[PDB]
Design a binder for this molecule. Structure first.
Ligand SMILES: Nc1ncnc2c1ncn2[C@@H]1O[C@H](COP(=O)(O)OP(=O)(O)OP(=O)(O)O)[C@@H](O)[C@H]1O
Ligand SMILES: [Mg+2]
Lengths: 662, 664
């Protein structure tokens, strides 16, 4: 209890940042740097209220659409009813005694709740922008559980599909998807440590049989089910397990609470699968290690791979350089990119550079079996060529990988266990749902590019490419995508690469001193829609303190994502930031890691993990640019410049001890 | 925080599950537990409750009766009229809170005497394990209370108005009796603002006037506000304006020390001490802590009379012995004298036999003279401004203030009236140096005493004669029946005591390892009981059910390291508490330095000043406590629950190798 006086200062400092009622006292009367701000349109009451008109309509529209009838589930093979597990971990069974199972058989509910998605997020928009424009973009999209009609229909999409088995040589994958053999991990190591080193979400579902969050399910998975899964892989005794504890191989096909468009949610509600934690984990050893060793577009000029691309630190400009080296169609190779279903294609006609950023309709249901089997092989094989001692174990793991991605039993609603009738079609949500879409896409655009050399330049048109992709590759292209755009390869300041978007973002050049910096950008509607529609349903218990903070965090993220480069966008968020109280800026917050909340857009860094220098700092224009530029990220300008001085409430007044005294 | 490694997720679970006692109960429920030697319990709930509730009442009702008495008026203190309030502001608030004292116009302060005793839970266990009618009595002789008003005044009067004797104290004499390592003094010349920061003090203690709040609440309002105002006015040597404009800056608070008083003398004994202003108390402590850490003790220099720095742990208990066992024959060659303030350890030989004197002084603070205090300050000040005079005249001014604080700082007691000590003899207890000021006056007096023996004055070895020499030549009282030289077992056997005498509140004992004897502290069970039964903490209103059973553990775990394990009877009572404490409350996330459980009450284990355990769920075994007081390594602290590490995270690593072949 006896401290040094410099410690007691550090004591109060790290403590005072948590006393809000005291934080205002100190901070309320202090200088503050104000971001560029769109001026206030209506009063408080007018704004909060209009956000409840838009909200109520959206709900009553979703509610009305949640009353439609879902289609039958004949298109799925039925395995009958899987019984309850089954295995205990000392005190408790791994499948909690009370949690959902219809006494004897496993079962689950079906979230389709409408539909309140905050309301302050839109409120801030009404206050600082035109109520007529705010309202329309706020009726454009909505984030909800979806509808039963749109769920089954979109499920029947990626189930009934007719896929084309991509003829793929293992050397072709070495061509299209190069990798540094060293950045893979020694998979010959003992299994325990290798699974622990796996990065996965902590709050997501652990799947069967746990039916609890992956953290509250980790010790049961790790110490109980993992060895019991291991010891059955070693002697191919998985079929014994699959009958005594069949839940260990069960999945859950769920509707993704996601930001959907309003007039298309009686049709479109995307389904995803959740495999068991032990299955999801063990497989993730390979998919994560390989994805880390994967080279991308910029590094290797022979790669069609984008899975691992980021914008910041020249990355946004690396896309440009890699794009312009594309060749005149029919004579020299083009430059195609593949991050899952999203693709960036660059070809040249009559010298000029053209860009297409097309989309595939429900592309997950299009991935053929032999593609999946090859990828799984290619990954497993690439591992056991450098770390060869475990040559047959990871094979058995790889064989399991394919089952999960193709023929894995899953629950949808009630006790009934369903399964895809055909080996084709990818079960979205399966460990590796990013490379499978990538590979199928790349192989499709590889053959397409190969077709161009044969003088068949007709495939540069939409009408023809649609047929070619459909009949020869089973892949299907959105009508109205294949729209070649003249690219300004060397744009000027404020000028754009193209109008199109890769990874949901336009490219843009902005000014740095004399230099120009290639940065991501969006039209105001796209920035505004994202703001109004937040990927989090209202917590209710959440405090008036925390959402005022969450808005500040989200407002910061979008500016980093490129909202700063669009004036109408930058102004709104800058207002939101400047709207935010002093205490909810310098409060010690609890997100990775006290440095505020990171931007949701996961392509800013390799890691997906982008993290701010500080909690009490806003992204200024010249800072955000400093990110995407090659060189240093600049000073992150503190909202309250000398805040450290007033929380400690100590202004170092230096006093020497050498003074001559009167 | 969303995506992270499973390696880090277990880290989350582990660090978190330790905060869920509902789970630690479920996990730590039926686990493997290491047990301590335990006293066969003799009672329990209800059967031991009233046993303590009755004692708790009869204590209070005797304290309340003792708190209800007259208090001889304060005529012995000069009265200074009344001091106005500050005054000085600091942004949105003063340095003197709007609500707290005064009452009106100018400063006051309320001296409270609760009734108002310690908790009973700690006593309940003593009734739950130990001899009832013994604990019924030993709990009644001592208690931790605010004290009584007569006991407060009488002893205040006793130390403010005692005829002291100024000491012959040449500064070169102080170099002998108090040698210091000149290099290890803090470079007092480097800047004041940063120099003050490196000062250690109790963060929960009162900061004194004009703050009237804890040192944590008053730290900022001192350093960027008051201290410059103090510095400014010092360097101009116009401190004499800061007097009359803001007099509460030099005002102290004379409060009664709440500690362990014996119930008989409650009506005539309650220790007073002066809470000094934080800025004053801080600035001075620059020279104290620098010199306290640069001082030398028994075990180092042989000439030194100083103990202020001695610690038992790591050979210290034996380092005391070897220093003692070269005290010569009385009258022919120098003895061995040991001064830690008002606690002294004298060794001398009489016809070859080694003898030990452990006497005490009666209110020794009030016996400390002016010239001693004046020459100690001068000694500590000049020791700094010679290695680093590059700051000579500033700290000399600081020195004169140090003198003022320890001598005639005006102070409040009760109500509004500011008093002040009539004479300039008598030390103001609670000042920064009370531990060195006492030490010097002790050493200065015993030096003369030792010098007298070399005149054939061996008569002073007897108590009847030693009493007068200290009262008529140093004004230093010695309690009646303490000066009793006991023959010393110079080489104690295993379990055999050095002497039965008491230095620094502890006996010196010798215990066993394998093959070597280890010198350790010790106390009889009656003393370990009193220390247990009387916690220096009153109930603390709102503190939960659970937080106490961790406290009883952390206390019991503390006495054992102090030396409660080396006594057989005491080792049983503590183990009984450790064994009875809950599984969860052993391994749970505890909040004391630095998560490694609570420290022990004793301050002289390692000094330094900070002794803390390796772990939070550790049990202080016999074989581990000895490992401290021996010169060897500290053993790994035995876990009460060895497998709790894995039992908490519910993961025991199963080796599953991937190189194995796949067959059938
Ligand atoms: N547990 C302990 N922790 C710290 N110091 C201790 C402990 N036990 C003894 N001491 C030291 O030993 C000394 C014991 O002297 P003690 O206070 O008993 O004299 P006293 O008779 O109470 O004098 P007074 O007349 O002032 O009441 C203390 O001053 C203290 O410095
Ligand atoms: Mg404050």
């Amino acid at each position: 209890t006896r401290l040094s006086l410099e410690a007691m200062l550090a004591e109060r400092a790290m403590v005072a940042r948590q006393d809000l009622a005291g934080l205002k006292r100190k901070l309320a009367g202090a200088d503050r740097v104000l971001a560029p701000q769109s001026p206030e349109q209506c009063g408080r009451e007018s704004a909060q209220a209009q956000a409840r008109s838009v909200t109520s309509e959206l709900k009553s529209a979703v509610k009305e659409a949640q009353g439609l009838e879902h289609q039958t589930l004949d298109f799925l093979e039925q395995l009958g009813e899987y019984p309850v597990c089954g295995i205990l971990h000392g005190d408790h069974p791994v499948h909690p005694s009370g949690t959902h199972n219809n006494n004897g058989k496993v079962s689950v509910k079906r979230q389709f709740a409408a539909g309140v998605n905050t309301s302050d997020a839109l409120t801030c928009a009404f206050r600082f922008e035109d109520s007529d424009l705010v309202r329309e973009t706020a009726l454009k999209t909505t984030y909800t559980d979806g509808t039963w009609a749109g769920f089954v229909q979109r499920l029947k999409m990626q189930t009934t599909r007719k896929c084309v088995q991509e003829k793929v040589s293992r050397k072709l994958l070495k061509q299209l998807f190069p990798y540094d053999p060293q950045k893979l991990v020694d998979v010959s190591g003992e299994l325990s440590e290798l699974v622990l080193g796996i990065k996965t979400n902590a709050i997501a579902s652990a799947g069967p049989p746990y039916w609890r969050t992956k953290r509250d399910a980790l010790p049961d998975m790790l110490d109980c089910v993992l060895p019991l899964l291991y010891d059955h892989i070693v002697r191919k005794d998985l079929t014994t397990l699959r009958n005594k504890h069949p839940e260990l191989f069960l999945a859950e096909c769920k509707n993704k609470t996601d930001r959907y468009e309003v007039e298309s949610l009686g049709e479109k509600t995307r389904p995803y699968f959740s495999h068991p934690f032990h299955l999801s984990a063990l497989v993730s050893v390979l998919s994560q290690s390989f994805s880390g060793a994967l080279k991308i577009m910029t590094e290797d000029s022979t790669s069609f791979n984008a899975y691992g691309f980021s914008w910041t630190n020249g990355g946004a400009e690396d896309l440009a350089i890699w794009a312009r080296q594309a060749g005149e169609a029919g004579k020299k190779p083009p430059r195609i990119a593949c991050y899952g279903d999203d693709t960036d294609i660059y070809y040249r006609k009559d010298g000029k550079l053209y860009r297409i950023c097309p989309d595939f309709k429900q592309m997950d249901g299009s991935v053929d079996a032999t593609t999946i089997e090859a990828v799984v092989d290619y990954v497993v094989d690439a591992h056991v060529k450098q770390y060869p001692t475990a040559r047959q174990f990871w094979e058995e793991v790889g064989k399991l990988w394919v089952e999960m991605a193709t023929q894995s039993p899953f629950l949808i609603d009630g006790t009934k266990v369903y399964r895809k009738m055909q080996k084709d079609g990818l079960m979205t949500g399966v460990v590796g749902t990013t490379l499978f879409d990538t590979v199928k896409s790349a192989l499709a655009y590889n053959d397409w590019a190969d077709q161009l050399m044969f003088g068949s330049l007709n495939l540069l048109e939409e009408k023809y490419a649609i047929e070619f992709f459909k009949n020869k590759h089973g892949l299907v292209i959105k009508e109205g995508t294949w729209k070649p755009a003249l690219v300004n390869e060397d744009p000027g300041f404020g000028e754009l690469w193209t109008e199109q978007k890769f990874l949901g973002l336009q490219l843009k050049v902005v000014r740095r001193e004399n230099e120009k910096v290639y940065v991501p950008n969006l039209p105001f509607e796209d920035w505004l829609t994202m703001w109004v529609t937040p990927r989090s349903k209202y917590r209710s218990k959440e405090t008036e303190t925390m959402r005022e903070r969450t808005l500040f965090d989200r407002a910061r993220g979008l500016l980093v994502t490129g909202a700063v480069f669009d004036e109408r966008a930058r102004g709104l968020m800058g207002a939101v930031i400047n709207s935010t109280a002093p205490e909810v800026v310098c409060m010690r917050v609890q997100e990775g890691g006290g440095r505020g909340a990171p931007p949701a857009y996961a392509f800013l860094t390799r890691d997906g993990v982008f993290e701010f220098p500080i909690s009490d700092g806003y992204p200024s224009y010249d800072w955000v640019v400093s990110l995407y530029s090659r060189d240093h990220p600049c000073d992150m300008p503190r909202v309250f410049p000398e805040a450290a001085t007033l929380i400690a409430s100590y202004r170092k007044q230096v006093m020497d001890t050498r003074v001559v005294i009167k």
